[PDB]
Short mmCIF file of C-alpha atoms in Angstrom, two decimals:
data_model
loop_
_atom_site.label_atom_id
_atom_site.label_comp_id
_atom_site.label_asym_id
_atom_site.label_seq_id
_atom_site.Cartn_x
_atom_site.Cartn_y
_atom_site.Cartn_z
CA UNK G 1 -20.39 8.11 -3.01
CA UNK G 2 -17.93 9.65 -0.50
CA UNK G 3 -15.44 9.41 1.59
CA UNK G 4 -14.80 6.56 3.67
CA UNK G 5 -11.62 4.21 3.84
CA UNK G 6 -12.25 1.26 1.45
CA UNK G 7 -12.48 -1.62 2.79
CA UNK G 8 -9.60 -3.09 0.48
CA UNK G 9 -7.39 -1.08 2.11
CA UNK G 10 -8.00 -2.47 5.93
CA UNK G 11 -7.23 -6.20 4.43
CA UNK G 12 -4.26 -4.86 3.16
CA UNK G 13 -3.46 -3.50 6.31
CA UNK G 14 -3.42 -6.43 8.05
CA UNK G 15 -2.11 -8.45 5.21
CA UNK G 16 0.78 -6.36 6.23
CA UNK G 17 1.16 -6.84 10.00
CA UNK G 18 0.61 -10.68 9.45
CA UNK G 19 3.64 -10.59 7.49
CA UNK G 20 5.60 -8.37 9.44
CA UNK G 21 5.07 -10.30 12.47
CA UNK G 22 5.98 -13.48 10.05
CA UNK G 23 9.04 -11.64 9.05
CA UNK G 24 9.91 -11.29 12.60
CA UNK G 25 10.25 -14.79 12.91
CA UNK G 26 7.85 -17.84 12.60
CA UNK G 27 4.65 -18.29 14.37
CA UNK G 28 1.77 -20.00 15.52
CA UNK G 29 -1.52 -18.62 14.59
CA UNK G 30 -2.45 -18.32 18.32
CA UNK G 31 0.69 -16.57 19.29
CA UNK G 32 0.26 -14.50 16.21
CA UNK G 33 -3.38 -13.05 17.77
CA UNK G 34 -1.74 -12.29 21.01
CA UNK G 35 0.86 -10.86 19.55
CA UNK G 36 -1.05 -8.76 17.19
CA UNK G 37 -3.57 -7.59 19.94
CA UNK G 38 -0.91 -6.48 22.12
CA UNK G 39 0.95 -4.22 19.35
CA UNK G 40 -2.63 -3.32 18.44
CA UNK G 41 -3.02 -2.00 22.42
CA UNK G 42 -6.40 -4.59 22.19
CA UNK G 43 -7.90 -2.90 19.18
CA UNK G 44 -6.68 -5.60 16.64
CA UNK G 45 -9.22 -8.25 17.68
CA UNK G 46 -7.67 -10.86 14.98
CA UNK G 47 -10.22 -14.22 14.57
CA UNK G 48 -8.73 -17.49 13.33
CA UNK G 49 -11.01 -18.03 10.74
CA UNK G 50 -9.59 -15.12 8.89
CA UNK G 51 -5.88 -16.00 9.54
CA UNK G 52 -6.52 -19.52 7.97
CA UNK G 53 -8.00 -18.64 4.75
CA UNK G 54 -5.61 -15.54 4.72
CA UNK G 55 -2.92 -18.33 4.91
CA UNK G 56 -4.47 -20.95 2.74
CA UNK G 57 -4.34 -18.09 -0.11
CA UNK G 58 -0.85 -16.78 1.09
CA UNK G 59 0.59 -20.33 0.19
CA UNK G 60 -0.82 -21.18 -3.36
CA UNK G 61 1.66 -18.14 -4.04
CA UNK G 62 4.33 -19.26 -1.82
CA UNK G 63 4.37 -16.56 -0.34
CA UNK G 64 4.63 -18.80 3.08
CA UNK G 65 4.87 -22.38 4.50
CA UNK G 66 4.04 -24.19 6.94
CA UNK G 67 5.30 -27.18 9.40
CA UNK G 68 4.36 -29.21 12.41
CA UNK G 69 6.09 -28.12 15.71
CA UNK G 70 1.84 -33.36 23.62
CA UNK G 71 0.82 -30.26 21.56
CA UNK G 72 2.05 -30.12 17.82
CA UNK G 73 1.42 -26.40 16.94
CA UNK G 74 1.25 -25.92 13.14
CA UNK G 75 4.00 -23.00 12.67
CA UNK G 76 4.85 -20.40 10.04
CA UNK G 77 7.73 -19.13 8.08
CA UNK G 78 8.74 -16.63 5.56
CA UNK G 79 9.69 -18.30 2.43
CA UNK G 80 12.77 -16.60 0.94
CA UNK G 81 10.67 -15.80 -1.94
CA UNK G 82 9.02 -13.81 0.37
CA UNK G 83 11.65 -12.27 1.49
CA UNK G 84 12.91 -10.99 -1.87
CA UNK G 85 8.94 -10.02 -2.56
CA UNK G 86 8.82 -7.61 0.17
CA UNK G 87 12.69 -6.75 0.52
CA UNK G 88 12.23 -5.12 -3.30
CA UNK G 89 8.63 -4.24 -2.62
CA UNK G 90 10.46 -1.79 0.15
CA UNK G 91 13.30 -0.54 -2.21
CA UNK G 92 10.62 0.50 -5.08
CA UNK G 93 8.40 1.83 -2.71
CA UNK G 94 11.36 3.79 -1.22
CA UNK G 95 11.98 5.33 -4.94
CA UNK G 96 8.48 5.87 -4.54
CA UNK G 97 8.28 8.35 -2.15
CA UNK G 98 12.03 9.82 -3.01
CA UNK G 99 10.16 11.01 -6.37
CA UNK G 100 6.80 12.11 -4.04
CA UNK G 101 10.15 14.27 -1.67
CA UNK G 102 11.33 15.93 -5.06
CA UNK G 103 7.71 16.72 -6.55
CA UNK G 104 7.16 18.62 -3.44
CA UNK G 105 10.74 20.30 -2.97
CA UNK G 106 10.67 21.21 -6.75
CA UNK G 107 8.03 24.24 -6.52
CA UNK R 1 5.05 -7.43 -10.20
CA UNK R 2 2.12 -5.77 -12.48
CA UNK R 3 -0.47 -4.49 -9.37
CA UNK R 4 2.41 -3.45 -7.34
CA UNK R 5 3.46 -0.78 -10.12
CA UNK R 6 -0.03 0.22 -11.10
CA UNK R 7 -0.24 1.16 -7.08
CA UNK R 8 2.79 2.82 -7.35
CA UNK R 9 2.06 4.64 -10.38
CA UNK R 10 -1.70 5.89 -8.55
CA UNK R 11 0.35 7.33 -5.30
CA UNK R 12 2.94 9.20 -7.54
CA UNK R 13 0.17 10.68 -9.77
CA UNK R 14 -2.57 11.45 -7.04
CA UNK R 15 0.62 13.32 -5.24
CA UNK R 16 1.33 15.21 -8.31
CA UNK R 17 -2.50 16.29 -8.39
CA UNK R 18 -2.62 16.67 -4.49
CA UNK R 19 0.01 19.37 -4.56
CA UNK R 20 -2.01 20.97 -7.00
CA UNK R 21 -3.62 20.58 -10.26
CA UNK R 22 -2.11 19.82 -13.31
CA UNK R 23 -2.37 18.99 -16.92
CA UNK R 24 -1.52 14.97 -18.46
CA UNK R 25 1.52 16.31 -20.92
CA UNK R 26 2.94 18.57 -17.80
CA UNK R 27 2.11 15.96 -15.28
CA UNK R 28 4.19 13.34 -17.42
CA UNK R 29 7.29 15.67 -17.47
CA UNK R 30 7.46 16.57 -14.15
CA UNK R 31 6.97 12.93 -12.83
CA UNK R 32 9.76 12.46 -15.43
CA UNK R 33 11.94 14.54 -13.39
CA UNK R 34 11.01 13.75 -10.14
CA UNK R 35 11.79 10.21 -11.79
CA UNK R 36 15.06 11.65 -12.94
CA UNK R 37 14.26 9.75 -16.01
CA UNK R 38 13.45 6.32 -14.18
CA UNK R 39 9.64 6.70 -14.96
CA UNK R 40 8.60 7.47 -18.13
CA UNK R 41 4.59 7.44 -17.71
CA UNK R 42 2.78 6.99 -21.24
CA UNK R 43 -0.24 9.17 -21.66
CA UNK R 44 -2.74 5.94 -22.08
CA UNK R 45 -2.06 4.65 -18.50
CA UNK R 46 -2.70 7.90 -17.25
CA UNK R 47 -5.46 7.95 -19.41
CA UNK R 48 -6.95 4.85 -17.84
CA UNK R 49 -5.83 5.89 -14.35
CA UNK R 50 -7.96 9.19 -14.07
CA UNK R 51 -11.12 7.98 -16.32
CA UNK R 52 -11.42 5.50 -13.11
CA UNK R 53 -10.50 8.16 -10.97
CA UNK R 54 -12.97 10.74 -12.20
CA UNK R 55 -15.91 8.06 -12.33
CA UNK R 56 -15.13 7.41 -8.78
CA UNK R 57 -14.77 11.27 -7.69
CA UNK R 58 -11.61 10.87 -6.64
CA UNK R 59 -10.42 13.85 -9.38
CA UNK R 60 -12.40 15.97 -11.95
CA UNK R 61 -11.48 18.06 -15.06
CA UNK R 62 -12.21 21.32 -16.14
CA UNK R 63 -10.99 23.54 -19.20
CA UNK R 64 -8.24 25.75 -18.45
CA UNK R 65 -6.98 25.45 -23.96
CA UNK R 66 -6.11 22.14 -21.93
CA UNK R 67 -8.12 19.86 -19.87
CA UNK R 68 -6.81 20.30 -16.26
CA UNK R 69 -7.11 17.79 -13.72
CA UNK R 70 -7.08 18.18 -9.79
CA UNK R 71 -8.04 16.22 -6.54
CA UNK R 72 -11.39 16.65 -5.61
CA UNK R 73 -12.09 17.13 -1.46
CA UNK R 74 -13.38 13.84 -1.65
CA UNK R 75 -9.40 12.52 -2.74
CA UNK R 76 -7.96 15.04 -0.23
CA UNK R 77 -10.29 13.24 2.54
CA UNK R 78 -9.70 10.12 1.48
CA UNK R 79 -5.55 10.78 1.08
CA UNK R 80 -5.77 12.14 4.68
CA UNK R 81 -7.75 9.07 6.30
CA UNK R 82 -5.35 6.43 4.42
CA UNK R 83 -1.81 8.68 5.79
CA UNK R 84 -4.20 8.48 9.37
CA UNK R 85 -4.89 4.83 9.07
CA UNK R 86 -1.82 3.29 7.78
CA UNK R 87 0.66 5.48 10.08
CA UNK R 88 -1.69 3.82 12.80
CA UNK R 89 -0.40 0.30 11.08
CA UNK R 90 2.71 1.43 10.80
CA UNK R 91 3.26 2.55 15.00
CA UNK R 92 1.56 -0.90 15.62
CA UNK R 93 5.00 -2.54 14.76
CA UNK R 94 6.25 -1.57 16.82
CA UNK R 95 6.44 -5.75 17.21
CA UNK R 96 9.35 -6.33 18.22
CA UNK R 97 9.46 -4.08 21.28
CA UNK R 98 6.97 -6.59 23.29
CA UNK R 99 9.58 -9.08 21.61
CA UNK R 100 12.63 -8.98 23.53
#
């Protein structure tokens, strides 16, 4: 093989946008998309399809939930144990890359 | 949570081998003191780390007597397209400026 950027690592990436925007405040999956594609510039052409399985999975873990918002749009939020997931996900990354800063200033 | 440290654990060593190459035993004591004593890798999880590493051609070995390891130009590529790709994530939030 070679070089390329592995695919794992693009659903990751916008693993991590959906819940940025999530963290931002709740959503609709619609609003999400334009949302998304306007960050994106128009190069983050988000399908539904995706965002509803993505979600479906997000949940078993709680990671999410969900309520009902003539339309009734089906919203979003950021359960607090997602919070404390990616609040401490931030902190140990954060000693992460203070040990990467003192690898490199050491020689 | 488990993944989240093995990750981790593969930026802080491919970092150690991407400023150069480097030797398990040394490797473990200077991540010790970048650590400052927080991270206190074992040699069998390195061990584990780089077999999968060197299978994927991510790092190789050579005799230098101790095995030496070091980043291969297919792990510098690939460290330079994920800093390219993710900083491109990163300036696309950046979501809260078409907020408000």
């Amino acid at each position: 093989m070679g070089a390329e950027i592995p695919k794992e690592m693009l659903r990751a990436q916008t693993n991590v946008i959906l819940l940025n925007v999530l963290k931002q405040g709740d959503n609709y999956v619609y609003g999400i998309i334009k949302q998304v594609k306007e960050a994106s510039n128009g190069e983050m052409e988000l399908n539904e399809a995706t965002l509803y399985t993505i979600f479906d999975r997000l949940e078993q873990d709680g990671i999410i939930s969900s309520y009902w918002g003539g339309g009734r749009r089906k919203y979003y939020r950021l359960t607090e144990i997602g919070h404390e997931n990616c609040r401490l996900a931030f902190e140990s990354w954060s000693r992460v890359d203070k040990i990467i800063e003192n690898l490199e200033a050491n020689k």
